[PDB]
Design a protein around this nucleic acid. Structure first.
Ligand code: MET
Ligand SMILES: [K+]
Ligand SMILES: [K+]
Ligand SMILES: [K+]
Ligand SMILES: [K+]
Ligand SMILES: [K+]
Ligand SMILES: [K+]
Ligand SMILES: [K+]
Ligand SMILES: [K+]
Ligand SMILES: [K+]
Ligand SMILES: [Mg+2]
Ligand SMILES: [Mg+2]
Ligand SMILES: [Mg+2]
Ligand SMILES: [Mg+2]
Ligand SMILES: [Mg+2]
Ligand SMILES: [Mg+2]
Ligand SMILES: [Mg+2]
Ligand SMILES: [Mg+2]
Ligand SMILES: [Mg+2]
Ligand SMILES: [Mg+2]
Ligand SMILES: [Mg+2]
Ligand SMILES: [Mg+2]
Ligand SMILES: [Mg+2]
Ligand SMILES: [Mg+2]
Ligand SMILES: [Mg+2]
Ligand SMILES: [Mg+2]
Ligand SMILES: [Mg+2]
Ligand SMILES: [Mg+2]
Ligand SMILES: [Mg+2]
Ligand SMILES: [Mg+2]
Ligand SMILES: [Mg+2]
Ligand SMILES: [Mg+2]
Ligand SMILES: [Mg+2]
Ligand SMILES: [Mg+2]
Ligand SMILES: [Mg+2]
Ligand SMILES: [Mg+2]
Ligand SMILES: [Mg+2]
Ligand SMILES: [Mg+2]
Ligand SMILES: [Mg+2]
Ligand SMILES: [Mg+2]
Ligand SMILES: [Mg+2]
Ligand SMILES: [Mg+2]
Ligand SMILES: [Mg+2]
Ligand SMILES: [Mg+2]
Ligand SMILES: [Mg+2]
Ligand SMILES: [Mg+2]
Ligand SMILES: [Mg+2]
Ligand SMILES: [Mg+2]
Ligand SMILES: [Mg+2]
Ligand SMILES: [Mg+2]
Ligand SMILES: [Mg+2]
Ligand SMILES: [Mg+2]
Ligand SMILES: [Mg+2]
Ligand SMILES: [Mg+2]
Ligand SMILES: [Mg+2]
Ligand SMILES: [Mg+2]
Ligand SMILES: [Mg+2]
Ligand SMILES: [Mg+2]
Ligand SMILES: [Mg+2]
Ligand SMILES: [Mg+2]
Ligand SMILES: [Mg+2]
Ligand SMILES: [Mg+2]
Ligand SMILES: [Mg+2]
Ligand SMILES: [Mg+2]
Ligand SMILES: [Mg+2]
Ligand SMILES: [Mg+2]
Ligand SMILES: [Mg+2]
Ligand SMILES: [Mg+2]
Ligand SMILES: [Mg+2]
Ligand SMILES: [Mg+2]
Ligand SMILES: [Mg+2]
Ligand SMILES: [Mg+2]
Ligand SMILES: [Mg+2]
Ligand SMILES: [Mg+2]
Ligand SMILES: [Mg+2]
Ligand SMILES: [Mg+2]
Ligand SMILES: [Mg+2]
Ligand SMILES: [Mg+2]
Ligand SMILES: [Mg+2]
Ligand SMILES: [Mg+2]
Ligand SMILES: [Mg+2]
Ligand SMILES: [Mg+2]
Ligand SMILES: [Mg+2]
Ligand SMILES: [Mg+2]
Ligand SMILES: [Mg+2]
Ligand SMILES: [Mg+2]
Ligand SMILES: [Mg+2]
Ligand SMILES: [Mg+2]
Ligand SMILES: [Mg+2]
Ligand SMILES: [Zn+2]
Lengths: 305, 110, 150, 154, 59
RNA sequence: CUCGAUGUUGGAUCAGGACAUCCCGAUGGUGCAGCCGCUAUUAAAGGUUCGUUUGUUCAACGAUUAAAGUCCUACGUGAUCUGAGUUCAGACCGGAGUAAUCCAGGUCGGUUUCUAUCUACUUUCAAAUUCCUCCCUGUACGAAAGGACAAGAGAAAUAAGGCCUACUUCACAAAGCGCCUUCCCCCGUAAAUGAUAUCAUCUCAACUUAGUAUUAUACCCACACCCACCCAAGAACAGGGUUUGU
RNA sequence: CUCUUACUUUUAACCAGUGAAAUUGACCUGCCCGUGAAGAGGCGGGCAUAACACAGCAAGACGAGAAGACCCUAUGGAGCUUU
RNA sequence: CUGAACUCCUCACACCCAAUUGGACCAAUCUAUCACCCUAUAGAAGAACUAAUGUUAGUAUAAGUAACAUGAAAACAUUCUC
RNA sequence: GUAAAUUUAACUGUUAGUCCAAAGAGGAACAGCUCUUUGGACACUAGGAAAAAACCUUGUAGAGAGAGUAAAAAAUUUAACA
RNA sequence: GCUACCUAAGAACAGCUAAAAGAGCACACCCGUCUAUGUAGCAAAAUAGUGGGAAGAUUUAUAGGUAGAGGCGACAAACCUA
C-alpha cells in the first residue's frame, strides 16, 4: 500500500543501466519520426481561403534586440521548438464543436513521472511523453497524421502569430499591485491604512458585488498576445523570433498559433500548408530566414544616403 | 468585531472533524533491517543513530582528555583503536584514540 | 403531536368479528386497600359491582387482591399480549364501573394515532388504476412516429 | 515574490545570518560531525564545501588565509583546515560533506539534519543502502542487461 | 427533477432511444388554420360569392 | 422607526447606478453658404484635467482639454483612513447681564476604540477609446474674408493585458520612469414599390434598401510516479520538474 | 507628492507546547423586487442552491463596547451668582 | 366551479380579547388524624420562575483563535556570536 | 319585537389612540399632518385584497380523511383627405 | 507614604562659551511639544523618535504640618491615595 518510485528497489548497478536504457529508447523513437512523408502521410491539400492550419508548442528561451533597416530597434522573444509532435486528431463530428481539433505536444519529459493512462497513450503512439499538450482548431483539409514532427519553419518571417502561456504567478497580492489602486497617503495622519482597498461597496446594497476587485492570487493564468510579428526564423536550432514579449517566464512552454486578428486573415497563402516537411523539401532552407527589413548581423553598417 | 450569535455544536463538529483538520495516515514507515525498529524512508533510524551517537560521545570524551584543554586541535589525522588492536602501516603518524571496549561490529576498521 | 408519537394502521386481532367475535379482554387484576381512604370507591365496586360484572363476562378472569396500598390500580391483560394498568385512585363506584367497562370493549391494540379511519385487504374490485387503464390500443401496437415494415 | 531567491532568511538579519552559519561551520570543522535544524544545515552546507576549496589554495595564499580567518572563530582550526581537511580531499573535486535527515528534535519537533565531513574518524552514520543486486527485481533486470550486451556483440 | 423528464428538440429529429420509449402523442392544443391555397376546389366552390364586382373595374 | 447610541462637514480610497448627454457616435429643423453655433430626436459602451486662495461643498482666478456633465447611492463609503471645519472641559476680543454666565460672532488649543462569528465578495469581457499631424486642399463653399466633410497615411495619449533585451531602482530576481500587444455592431431617420382612398403615400398595410452579429473567433481541455528533493508554483493545501534519488 | 518600487526586521502563515477577552434568544444564517413599526437572510412574487475546511476583505448583520454626554421630560439632584 | 373557524351534517360542549374583576381546581412542604410501594380529610405557610444588562456556582460560544517563550555547537567540560 | 333595566352594597382597572367612511376646522381643497363630531374596525378569531393591526367577508370556541356558501381575478389602444 | 503648599535639617547639577548672569550650547536629571505605535496595551496614560529646561522661581531623599460646612491653589473650578 506504500507509495513507490521508479528507482526505489533498483540496485547500485541497475540505476545507470535503466537510465541509459530508457534514454536510448526515447532517442530512437524520436529519430524514427524524422521522415513523415515516407510513412504513409495523409493527403496534402492545397491552401484555400478560410482554412486554418495547426500551430506549434515552443519554449521561451529569452529576449534579444534586433534593428531594422530604418534604424529602429525592436526587441524580440526567442521561442525554440523542442520535440513538437502531433498527438491526436479528432474528427469534426466527434469534436463537439464547429471545427476539427488537432492535439500537439512538446518538450519530451521522463516516463517515470507520468500517469499510467498517459504512458500507455504514448506507448501506442510510439513517442516519449510530452510535458504540455495543446488543442488547435483546424479545418478538414489541414489534418495531419499523429506522430508527425513539427518544426519552427512552420512559420515564416513577416507572419503575425499569437502566443499563449501561463503568466508569471505573483502569489497573493494586494490591490495596489494586483489592480493598480492608488492606495492611501503615507503621512498627514494615516493610521494603519496605506495599501488597503478602502471602500468595497455602497451602504444601500448591503453586499459586495460579484467581480469586485479584491486582493487575491495574481498571475499564473493563461494570457494571449495578439499580432506578434515574426522577424527571424532559425531552422538549425528551430527558433522563432516573435516581436515584443510573450506571457510567462523564461524556459516556459508557450502555444504559438497564426494570428486571429481580422487584419491578418487569409495571409496563409504563401505559408506552408498543412505544415512544413523538411524531408520532402526540394532545396534545403538556409540556416536563418530574415524579414525584408531586418538588418542581418553580416550586413554592412546602416548608411542614410 | 464580536460574534453575532453562538455557534452550535453541529456547526462546530463539521469544522473540527473536517478531513482537512484530521491527522493524515503516514505510509512511509518501514522496519529498519539492522535493528528491527521502525523508521521513515527518508529519515535515519532513531535507534541506530542513537547507537552511533553514544559511541561518538565516548570517543569525543577521550579526544578531550588527550588534548587537555581548549584550542588543542591537532594538525594530524585521528584514528580510533579498541582493545586488542595495534596501529597499522597506514595509521602511522596519526593521533591514536583508545577505547576500553571491544570494537563494535558495525564500526568497520579502515 | 403526531410527529413526536408513534402511529399504526387500523386493524383487529385474528380478524375479530369476521367469523365470530371474541372478547379481547382476558384478565383484570384489582388491588384494593381494606383501610385506605383512596380505595373507598374500589371497595364499593367490589362489594356490589364486580360480582355482577363477572356474570356478564364469563370469559374474563377477575382477580381481586386486598392488600395495603396507597394508589389502587386495575391491570387489564388482553389476548394479543398487551398489558394496560389503570389507576382507580379516589374514583367513585360509577367512574370505576365506566373505566372497567371501557377496558372490556377495547381490542388491546396500542391507543395511538391511526393513519386511516378504515382498513381493507381488497380495496379494488374492478382493478386498480394504471396509466394504461383509459388508453386505447392501436393497430399492431405501433408507437407514435413509428414506421412498420421498413 | 521570492522568485530566484537562493539565500534563506534566518537570524536577526543579514549579518546575524552569517554569524549563525559561521558558528555552525566552526563547530563542523572541529567535530567533523554536527547536528542542527535541517534548514540551517542545508544553508551552511554550501559554505562548508567552499571552505575546503579555500584550504586547497594553501596557507601561503593571503586571500585563503583571510577567508579562513573570518569563518573559523577558533584560531586553532585554521591549521587544521590547511593541513588536515584540505590534504584529505586532495583527490576529490567535490562532495566533501554528506547531509542526512535525522528524527525531529524532541523539544520543539524541529526538522533536524546531521552533516559531517567524509572520511572522519567517528563511527559511520547509518547510511541508507539501496536494495541488494540479488533481489528478485534486480535479478530480472540483470538478466535483461546481459541479453542486450550479448545481442549487441552479435 | 421534473425538468429532467422534459425533452425538447428544435426540429423533427428525435433520438432513437427517445423514439423507442414513446407511448402516446398528445393532440396539439391549437388548430392550425389552412392557408388560402390549401383549400380544395370543392371547399372554394362551396363558399358563395358575396358581391358582384363592376365589369369595368381594373382591380 | 431608532436616545439600555442609526457617529456629523469636506477630503483620501473604491466606486455601483439613473440619463434630464458635458465630450465622442447617428439624425430632424434653422434667421443651416462655408467655418463656428442654436434647437430637437436617439445613444450610458468609453471618457469627463492639473493648480493658487478658502476647513470647505461652492465660488473667484491661472494654465489646459474632444469635454472639464447633472444627480442618486444612510447629504455612497470613518469595524478603510483623515479631523481642517463643526461640537464638551482652557483662553481671548466685541456685545448682552449687578453677577454667575451667555452670544448660526470671531479667535488659539483640544484622546477618532474594536483580535471578523454570519451574509456578501476575493482573475466577469480575451473585440479600445480619443486627440493631433500629413494628405485630400487652399479643393467643396463664398463677393471677399474665411474655410470643410468622406476616403487614405502616420504618430501619440489613456485604459486593459503582459514582459526584462537595453535604460533605470536594482542584480541568480522583483520593478518602472522602460518595452510589447490590443479585433464587431448601436435603429434616430433617409429612400423605393404600392393599398385602404384606382393620383399620391417610407407601411403599428402586405413589402424593399441603408440595416445589423445564434456577437465571431480565441483561451482552457490527458491524469495516483509522488516517500523524498527542487521550482520561474505557492500563506497552508494545490501545481510544475526529478531520464537533475550522494 | 507626480507614482511608486526593492530589500531587511517584527508581525504574518505552517509545525510543536501553553492557552485569553468582549460577544452569544434560538438559527437548518442566499440574491432581486415588492411589502411592512416607513432601510428584510426569516414576509409576498421570482431567481439561485451537493457537502465541508483554509487564507483575505470590511458593503450589511440599523456590527461589538458604554441603561446618549446632544435634546426634552421629572413638582429628581447638585455647583455657582444675585437688588 | 373553486373558496372560512360562516352555516348544515355524526358526536360532544364551561373549553379563543389587554388592564382589571369573579369563580372552579391544584403541585410540593410542615402539623393534627389516617394511611403504610406514597395516600386521605383538614389545619398551616419562606407554598410553584422560558426572562429583572437579576445573585452564586457549573460549562459552553468566540477558540484550540488572540497571545506567550529558548543565541550556537559540543565531550555538558567548554568554546563561540552579539 | 324582545330581556333587560334601575336601585342598594363592595372595589379595582382604563383616564398617553390608530386607520377608514361621513359633516367640518387649521395647513397648502400637503402629509401615514393636526383638532372635534357620527359610525365602523383594530388593540380577539378566521377567509380575502400578493405580503398586510385600521378596507371586505365572518364572529362563541371540541373531534371528522363530509357538505353548501360568504367576500374574493382589470379593463382599455386612438389623428389620410377634396 | 499620591498630589497642592509649607516647616526643620540634608543631597545633586559633567564639558564648552562668557566669566557678570531666574545667560547660551549640551550629559546626568526634571518636564512632556510634535508624530507614529499602542487602545483588555508592557502600562487603569506606556514605548520609540523628536523636543522644553538643565546654578535656578531648579531638581530631589527623610521626618513633620494644614482635613471635607475644610485644606491647599504663580485660578486650571487645579490638587487633597488611580
Ligand atoms: C451636537 O453638536 C451634539 N451631537 C452634541 C455634540 S457634543 C456631545
Ligand atoms: K437616538
Ligand atoms: K458613464
Ligand atoms: K488651505
Ligand atoms: K447572517
Ligand atoms: K397612406
Ligand atoms: K525599486
Ligand atoms: K463589515
Ligand atoms: K509598563
Ligand atoms: K505629613
Ligand atoms: Mg510566483
Ligand atoms: Mg502613494
Ligand atoms: Mg493626532
Ligand atoms: Mg491610533
Ligand atoms: Mg503608518
Ligand atoms: Mg442595509
Ligand atoms: Mg523562493
Ligand atoms: Mg526567524
Ligand atoms: Mg441594542
Ligand atoms: Mg469622498
Ligand atoms: Mg462609476
Ligand atoms: Mg436621451
Ligand atoms: Mg431613455
Ligand atoms: Mg465613443
Ligand atoms: Mg442640414
Ligand atoms: Mg454620508
Ligand atoms: Mg461603515
Ligand atoms: Mg466622513
Ligand atoms: Mg479641530
Ligand atoms: Mg469679554
Ligand atoms: Mg445668537
Ligand atoms: Mg499645540
Ligand atoms: Mg478650533
Ligand atoms: Mg475615538
Ligand atoms: Mg478607526
Ligand atoms: Mg481587519
Ligand atoms: Mg477562497
Ligand atoms: Mg479629413
Ligand atoms: Mg501595467
Ligand atoms: Mg398607386
Ligand atoms: Mg393606381
Ligand atoms: Mg411614390
Ligand atoms: Mg414622393
Ligand atoms: Mg502523491
Ligand atoms: Mg491572522
Ligand atoms: Mg467569557
Ligand atoms: Mg456575557
Ligand atoms: Mg442546510
Ligand atoms: Mg444555507
Ligand atoms: Mg427591502
Ligand atoms: Mg422569498
Ligand atoms: Mg472565513
Ligand atoms: Mg451599535
Ligand atoms: Mg453601522
Ligand atoms: Mg437613557
Ligand atoms: Mg446640557
Ligand atoms: Mg429639562
Ligand atoms: Mg409635575
Ligand atoms: Mg430633596
Ligand atoms: Mg370548504
Ligand atoms: Mg370543526
Ligand atoms: Mg360550543
Ligand atoms: Mg395529590
Ligand atoms: Mg393537602
Ligand atoms: Mg417564593
Ligand atoms: Mg431555574
Ligand atoms: Mg436570569
Ligand atoms: Mg476550545
Ligand atoms: Mg498553535
Ligand atoms: Mg477567528
Ligand atoms: Mg499569532
Ligand atoms: Mg519575541
Ligand atoms: Mg530570546
Ligand atoms: Mg374607586
Ligand atoms: Mg393621525
Ligand atoms: Mg370611535
Ligand atoms: Mg394600550
Ligand atoms: Mg393572508
Ligand atoms: Mg360556529
Ligand atoms: Mg526650610
Ligand atoms: Mg555645569
Ligand atoms: Mg540658564
Ligand atoms: Mg520623578
Ligand atoms: Mg514642574
Ligand atoms: Mg538651555
Ligand atoms: Mg488630622
Ligand atoms: Mg505650583
Ligand atoms: Mg479662569
Ligand atoms: Mg471654567
Ligand atoms: Zn535501526
Amino acid at each position: 500500500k506504500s507509495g513507490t518510485w521508479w528507482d526505489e528497489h533498483l540496485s547500485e548497478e541497475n540505476v545507470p543501466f535503466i537510465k541509459q536504457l530508457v534514454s536510448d529508447e526515447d532517442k530512437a523513437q524520436l529519430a524514427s519520426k524524422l521522415c513523415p512523408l515516407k510513412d504513409e502521410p495523409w493527403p496534402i491539400h492545397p491552401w484555400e481561403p478560410g482554412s486554418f492550419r495547426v500551430g506549434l508548442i515552443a519554449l521561451k528561451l529569452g529576449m534579444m534586440p534586433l534593428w531594422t533597416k530604418d534604424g529602429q530597434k525592436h526587441v524580440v522573444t526567442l521561442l525554440q521548438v523542442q520535440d513538437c509532435h502531433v498527438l491526436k486528431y479528432t474528427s469534426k463530428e466527434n469534436c463537439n464543436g464547429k471545427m476539427a481539433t488537432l492535439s500537439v505536444g512538446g518538450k519530451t519529459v521522463s516516463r517515470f513521472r507520468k500517469a499510467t493512462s498517459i504512458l500507455e497513450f504514448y506507448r501506442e503512439l510510439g513517442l516519449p511523453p510530452k510535458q504540455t499538450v495543446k488543442i488547435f482548431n483546424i479545418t478538414d483539409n489541414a489534418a495531419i497524421k499523429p506522430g508527425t514532427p513539427l518544426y519552427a519553419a512552420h512559420f515564416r518571417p513577416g507572419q503575425y502569430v499569437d502566443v499563449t502561456a501561463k503568466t508569471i504567478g505573483k502569489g497573493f497580492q494586494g490591490v495596489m499591485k494586483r489592480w493598480g489602486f492608488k492606495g492611501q497617503p503615507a503621512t498627514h495622519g494615516q493610521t494603519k491604512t496605506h495599501r488597503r482597498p478602502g471602500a468595497v461597496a455602497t451602504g444601500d446594497i448591503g453586499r459586495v458585488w460579484p467581480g469586485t476587485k479584491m486582493p487575491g492570487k495574481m498571475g499564473n493564468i493563461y494570457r494571449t498576445e495578439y499580432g506578434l510579428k515574426v522577424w527571424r526564423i532559425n531552422t538549425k536550432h528551430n527558433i522563432i523570433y516573435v516581436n515584443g514579449s510573450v506571457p510567462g517566464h523564461k524556459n516556459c512552454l508557450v502555444k504559438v498559433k497564426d494570428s486571429k486578428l481580422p487584419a491578418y486573415k487569409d495571409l496563409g497563402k504563401n505559408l506552408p500548408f498543412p505544415t512544413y516537411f523538411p524531408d520532402g523539401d526540394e532545396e534545403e532552407l538556409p540556416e536563418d530566414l530574415y524579414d525584408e527589413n531586418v538588418c542581418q548581423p553580416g550586413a554592412p553598417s546602416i548608411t542614410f544616403a | 468585531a464580536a460574534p453575532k450569535n453562538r455557534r452550535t455544536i453541529e456547526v462546530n463538529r463539521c469544522r473540527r472533524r473536517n478531513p482537512q483538520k484530521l491527522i493524515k495516515v503516514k505510509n512511509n514507515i518501514d522496519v529498519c533491517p539492522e535493528c528491527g525498529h521502525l523508521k521513515q524512508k527518508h529519515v535515519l533510524c532513531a535507534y541506530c543513530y542513537e547507537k552511533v551517537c553514544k559511541e561518538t560521545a565516548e570517543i569525543r570524551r577521550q579526544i578531550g582528555k588527550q588534548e587537555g584543554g581548549p584550542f588543542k586541535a591537532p594538525t594530524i589525522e585521528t584514528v580510533v583503536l579498541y582493545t586488542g588492536e595495534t596501529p597499522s602501516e597506514q595509521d602511522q603518524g596519526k593521533r591514536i584514540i583508545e577505547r576500553d571496549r571491544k570494537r563494535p561490529s558495525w564500526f568497520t576498521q579502515n | 403531536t403526531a410527529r413526536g408519537t408513534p402511529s399504526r394502521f387500523l386493524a383487529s386481532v385474528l380478524h375479530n368479528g369476521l367469523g365470530r367475535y371474541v372478547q379481547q379482554l382476558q384478565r383484570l387484576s384489582f388491588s384494593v386497600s381494606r383501610d385506605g381512604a383512596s380505595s373507598r370507591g374500589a371497595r364499593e365496586f367490589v362489594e356490589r359491582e364486580v360480582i355482577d360484572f363477572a356474570r356478564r363476562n364469563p370469559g374474563v378472569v377477575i382477580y381481586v387482591n386486598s392488600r395495603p396500598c396507597c394508589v389502587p390500580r386495575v391491570v387489564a391483560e388482553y389476548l394479543n399480549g398487551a398489558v394496560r394498568e389503570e389507576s382507580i385512585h379516589c374514583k367513585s363506584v360509577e367512574e370505576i364501573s365506566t373505566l372497567v367497562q371501557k377496558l372490556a370493549d377495547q381490542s388491546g391494540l396500542d391507543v395511538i394515532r391511526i393513519r386511516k379511519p378504515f382498513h381493507t385487504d381488497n380495496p379494488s374490485i374492478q382493478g386498480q388504476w394504471h396509466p394504461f387503464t383509459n388508453k386505447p390500443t392501436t393497430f399492431r401496437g405501433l408507437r407514435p412516429r413509428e414506421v412498420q415494415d421498413p | 515574490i521570492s522568485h530566484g531567491r537562493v539565500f534563506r532568511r534566518m537570524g536577526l538579519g543579514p549579518e546575524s545570518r552569517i554569524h549563525l552559519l559561521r558558528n555552525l561551520l566552526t563547530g563542523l570543522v572541529r567535530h567533523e560531525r554536527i547536528e542542527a535544524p535541517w534548514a540551517r544545515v542545508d544553508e551552511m552546507r554550501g559554505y562548508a564545501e567552499k571552505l575546503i576549496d579555500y584550504g586547497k589554495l594553501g596557507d601561503t595564499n593571503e586571500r585563503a588565509m583571510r577567508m579562513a580567518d573570518f569563518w573559523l572563530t577558533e584560531k586553532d582550526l585554521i591549521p587544521k583546515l590547511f593541513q588536515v581537511l584540505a590534504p584529505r580531499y586532495k583527490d576529490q573535486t567535490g562532495g566533501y560533506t554528506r547531509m542526512l535527515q535525522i528524527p525531529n528534535r524532541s523539544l520543539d519537533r524541529a526538522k533536524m539534519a546531521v552533516i559531517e565531513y567524509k572520511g572522519n574518524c567517528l563511527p559511520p552514520l547509518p547510511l541508507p543502502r539501496r536494495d541488494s543486486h540479488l533481489t528478485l527485481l534486480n535479478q530480472l533486470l540483470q538478466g535483461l542487461r546481459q541479453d542486450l550486451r550479448q545481442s549487441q556483440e552479435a | 427533477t421534473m425538468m429532467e423528464r422534459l425533452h425538447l428538440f428544435p426540429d423533427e429529429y428525435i433520438p432513437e432511444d427517445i423514439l423507442k420509449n414513446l407511448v402516446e402523442e398528445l393532440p396539439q392544443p391549437r388548430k392550425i388554420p389552412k392557408r388560402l391555397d390549401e383549400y380544395t376546389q370543392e371547399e372554394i366552390d362551396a363558399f358563395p360569392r358575396l358581391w358582384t364586382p363592376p365589369e369595368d373595374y381594373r382591380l
